[PDB]
């Protein structure tokens, strides 16, 4: 059973966003399991599962803890506006390939 801890929750009205640091705790598990972590984050906060996102995962030595960077949006459309395209390729729906020449 994974365990979740949010810390230092601030609000960004300019980016319509709420951001925090994510202490993810998995004793006798491998690692963070980021999609399941987005599920757990989207249910501890409000619904917006295609508007919650995590990117900066570092597991400490020997496992157990990992610190990530969590940012949760309202309004999935403006989340699609404000998130970068590589994270949208990683998690959500966007896929535009670069033209392979030279």
Partner 1 sequence: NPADKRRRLAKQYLENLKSEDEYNNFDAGDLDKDIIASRLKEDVAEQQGRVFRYFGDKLLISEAKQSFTRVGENNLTCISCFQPVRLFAYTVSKDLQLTKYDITDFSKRPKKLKYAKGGAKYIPTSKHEYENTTEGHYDEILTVAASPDGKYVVTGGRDRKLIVWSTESLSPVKVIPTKDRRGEVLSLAFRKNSDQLYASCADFKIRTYSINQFSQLEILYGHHDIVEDISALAMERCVTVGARDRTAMLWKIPDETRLTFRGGDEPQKLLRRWMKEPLFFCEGSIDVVSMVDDFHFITGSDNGNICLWSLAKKKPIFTERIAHGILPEPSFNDISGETDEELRKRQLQGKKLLQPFWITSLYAIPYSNVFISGSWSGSLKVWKISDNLRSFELLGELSGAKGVVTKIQVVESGKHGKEKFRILASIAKEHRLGRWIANVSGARNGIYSAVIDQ
Partner 2 sequence: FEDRFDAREHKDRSNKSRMQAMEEYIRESSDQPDWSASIGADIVNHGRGGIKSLRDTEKERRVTSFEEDNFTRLNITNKAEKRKQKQRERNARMNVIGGEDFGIFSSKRKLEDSTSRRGAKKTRSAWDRAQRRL
Q: Which positions touch partner 2 (CB under 8 A)?
A: 8, 19, 21, 56, 58, 61, 67, 69
Q: Does 16 engage in binding with partner 1 (CB under 8 A)?
A: no
Judge contact between 84 and 96, C-beta under 8 A: no
Among partner 1, partner 2, none, the one that 102 touches (CB under a kind-dependent 5 to 8 A) is none
Would you say 63 or 90 has its CB closer to partner 1? 63
Q: Does 15 engage in binding with partner 1 (CB under 8 A)?
A: no
Judge contact between 53 and 86, C-beta under 8 A: no
Judge contact between 37 and 54, C-beta under 8 A: yes
């Amino acid at each position: 059973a994974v365990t979740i801890r949010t810390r230092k929750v601030i609000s960004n009205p300019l980016l319509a966003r709420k951001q925090f640091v994510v202490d993810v705790l998995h004793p006798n598990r491998a690692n963070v399991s980021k999609d399941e972590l987005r599920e757990k984050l989207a249910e501890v906060y409000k619904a917006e599962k295609d508007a919650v996102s995590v990117f900066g995962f570092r597991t400490q030595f020997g496992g157990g803890k990992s610190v990530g960077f969590g940012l949760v949006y309202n309004s999935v459309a403006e989340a699609k506006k404000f998130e970068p395209t590589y994270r949208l390729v990683r998690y959500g729906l966007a896929e535009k390939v670069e033209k392979a020449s030279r």
